[PDB]
Amino acid sequence: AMSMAVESTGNAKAEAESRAEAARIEGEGSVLQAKLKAQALAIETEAELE
Amino acid sequence: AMSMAVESTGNAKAEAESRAEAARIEGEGSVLQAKLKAQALAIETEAELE
């Protein structure tokens, strides 16, 4: 039953830490990304008013 | 009956601990993920009203 735990949790864990870790990069990305769409769709919006 | 117990509780324990550990990771992740949506959907919405 002790190995049964190590195995069961240990698996679900690897799978979850993966999921969470992928999202971690994906989020840090959307920040850097939306921050670029910012300056972008703002240099666009400004010379659009002109 | 003592073995019957040790096995049954050990078997469901390893399973429910897995469940619990997965959502622990997932839940910790959702906090960091929403906190990155925060600054993301903020940076975006900010230079959107600008």
From Swiss-Prot, chains A, B:
<protein>
    <recommendedName>
        <fullName>Major vault protein</fullName>
    </recommendedName>
</protein>
<comment type="function">
    <text>Required for normal vault structure. Vaults are multi-subunit structures that may act as scaffolds for proteins involved in signal transduction. Vaults may also play a role in nucleo-cytoplasmic transport. Down-regulates IFNG-mediated STAT1 signaling and subsequent activation of JAK. Down-regulates SRC activity and signaling through MAP kinases.</text>
</comment>
<comment type="subunit">
    <text>The vault ribonucleoprotein particle is a huge (400 A x 670 A) cage structure of 12.9 MDa. It consists of a dimer of half-vaults, with each half-vault comprising 39 identical major vault protein (MVP) chains, PARP4 and one or more vault RNAs (vRNAs). Interacts with TEP1. Interacts with PTEN and activated MAPK1. The phosphorylated protein interacts with the SH2 domains of PTPN11 and SRC. Interacts with APEX1. May interact with ZNF540.</text>
</comment>
